Write a protein that binds this ligand. Structure first.
Ligand SMILES: Nc1ncnc2c1ncn2[C@@H]1O[C@H](COP(=O)(O)OP(=O)(O)O)[C@@H](O)[C@H]1O
Lengths: 62, 43, 50, 371
């Protein structure tokens, strides 16, 4: 009995599994396979450049 | 090796010299090996 | 149609004027632009200083 | 651990997620549906209006309308409904506890930003909210700070060049040629095959057809010759009622309106010509980098073969000595949100947030002071 093992209405964040489009099913898996947001933050050389660029663009204007 | 650099100095400003360089020189933009950069789709 | 300008030279100071003309033609810091990401700030600073 | 929220809005798609996450938590169309048929069944579930993913399920009994067209909102109440559904039903988080990050088109009227800020502070009691440019965030998601970016959504197409983190306001080019107009053109050219679609649900069906069975031709005349002289370029779509249609010749005809707007009769030029003109408006010294870094963004640029045709058309107008390359990330649909997820995560960005208390003495114009 898999059907007794779990219930669709017990967990809403398991209920999200049923109502997915197939291309939406790939987009999440591929995008957390890539981990781009983790890559940008973990890599320093681009990171402090972005840091200081935002800070000193605030410094003179906007 | 000392003459080539002097003569390239002379060519840079506009002295239209006809001296043939034995060693050709190219300036190119530097290459990246950060993991952020994505390769281009085509050549 | 016009070559980059050359500053007139002293009889004993020709190559100083040569260097200053070349430096006004070619900037010593050309990494600014798309190559800023290629090198980190600490190494780019040393390259500029040297 | 209070984390910021990133909410990306575009005409036809709303995404939302916590800052610092790889994936947005909620993705759903920006649709509002109201019942059209006489509802007679006492005691079962009826509602005044359906919104979001639930509204798309019941397309048969609903009239579906979009609150945003061409990047400009038409009815603000529907926008409030979508924002409330995003904050409460999708993420189940209080809007007044976490800061929220918002995006918009670069060129837009004055009143949009002010009304958006007023609604976001007054209705939801947001302690801090910031407005950012979509295309700039897409370039940050690509991870290069320089280059010219092309973001083409379902509302409007725009190319902006960004040099050293600054987007030049004079060189920004905007063209009102989007995917919804392509859907309308595809419906008009499917009329002549014998299949007729008129209602809004049929427009969504046509949009799904366009997403599944469209591609960009490398040579337009040669592909017309091949499609006329052979039946190889024919695919069959299977309708939700069981009927089967043959898309046939039209597959490369609908996206080609992106390059030649003379099919739609628009006065403006093509998208590649728009990108080329935007590059021409910039300074000469940076043009090399503008030809060296070009990324594609938006769901409209997911047509197969868009990169090769774009590169060829840019190379045709470019000087012979220039080098042309086109960057197309596979996740170009959700790049903008990813950029937002970068921008809220920085340690220098906490001072960039708009203060709730400062808005009290400033007012709705405060964003024009700070952004
Ligand atoms: N897989 C796909 N292939 C081709 N076109 C697509 C695909 N997915 C979406 N589109 C087109 O892109 C549009 C959605 O663009 P979107 O990225 O949502 O714009 P925005 O987010 O700026 O509103 C849709 O109208 C659709 O026509």
């Amino acid at each position: 009995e898999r059907y007794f093992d779990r219930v669709d209405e017990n967990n809403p964040e398991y209920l999200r599994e049923r109502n997915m489009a197939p291309d939406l099913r790939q987009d999440f898996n591929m995008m957390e396979q890539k981990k781009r947001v983790s890559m940008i933050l973990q890599s320093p050389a681009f990171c402090e450049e972005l840091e200081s660029m935002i800070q000193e663009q605030f410094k003179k204007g906007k | 090796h000392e003459f080539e650099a002097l003569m390239r100095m002379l060519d840079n400003l506009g002295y239209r010299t006809g001296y043939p360089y034995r060693y050709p020189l190219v300036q190119e933009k530097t290459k990246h090996k950060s993991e952020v950069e994505i390769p281009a789709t085509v050549t | 149609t016009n070559v980059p300008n050359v500053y007139p030279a002293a009889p004993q100071g020709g190559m100083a004027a040569l260097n200053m003309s070349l430096g006004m033609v070619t900037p010593v810091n050309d990494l600014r632009g798309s190559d800023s990401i290629a090198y980190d700030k600490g190494e780019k600073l040393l390259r500029c200083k040297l | 651990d209070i984390a910021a929220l990133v909410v990306d809005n575009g005409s036809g798609m709303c995404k939302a997620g916590f800052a610092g996450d790889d994936a947005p938590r909620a993705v759903f169309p920006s649709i509002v549906g109201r019942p059209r048929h006489q509802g007679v069944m006492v005691g079962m579930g009826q509602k005044d209006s359906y919104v979001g993913d639930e509204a798309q399920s019941k397309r048969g009994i609903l009239t579906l309308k979009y609150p945003i067209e061409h990047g400009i909102v038409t009815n603000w109440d529907d926008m409030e409904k979508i924002w409330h559904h995003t904050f409460y039903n999708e993420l189940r988080v209080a809007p007044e506890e976490h800061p929220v990050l918002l995006t918009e088109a670069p060129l837009n009227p004055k009143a949009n930003r002010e009304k958006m800020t007023q609604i976001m502070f007054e209705t939801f009691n947001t302690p801090a909210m910031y407005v950012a440019i979509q295309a700039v965030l897409s370039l940050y998601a690509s991870g290069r700070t320089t280059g010219i970016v092309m973001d083409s959504g379902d509302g409007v197409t725009h190319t902006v060049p960004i040099y050293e983190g600054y987007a030049l306001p004079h060189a920004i080019l905007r063209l009102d040629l989007a995917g919804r107009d392509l859907t309308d053109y595809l419906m008009k050219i499917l009329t002549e095959r014998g299949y007729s679609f008129t209602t809004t649900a049929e427009r969504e069906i046509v949009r799904d057809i366009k997403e599944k069975l469209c591609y960009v031709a490398l040579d337009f005349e040669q592909e017309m010759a091949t499609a006329a002289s052979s039946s190889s370029l024919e695919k069959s779509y299977e309708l939700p009622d069981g009927q089967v249609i043959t898309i046939g010749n039209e597959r490369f005809r609908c996206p080609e309106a992106l390059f030649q707007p003379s099919f739609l009769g628009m006065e403006s030029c093509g998208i590649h010509e728009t990108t080329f003109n935007s590059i021409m408006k910039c300074d000469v010294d940076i043009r090399k980098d503008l030809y060296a870094n070009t990324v594609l963004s938006g769901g409209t640029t997911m047509y197969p073969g868009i990169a090769d045709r774009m590169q060829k058309e840019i190379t045709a107008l470019a000087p012979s000595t220039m080098k042309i390359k086109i960057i197309a990330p596979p996740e170009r649909k959700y790049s903008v949100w990813i950029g937002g997820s970068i921008l809220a995560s920085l340690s220098t960005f906490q001072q960039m947030w708009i203060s709730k208390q400062e808005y009290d003495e400033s007012g709705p114009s405060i964003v024009h002071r700070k952004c």
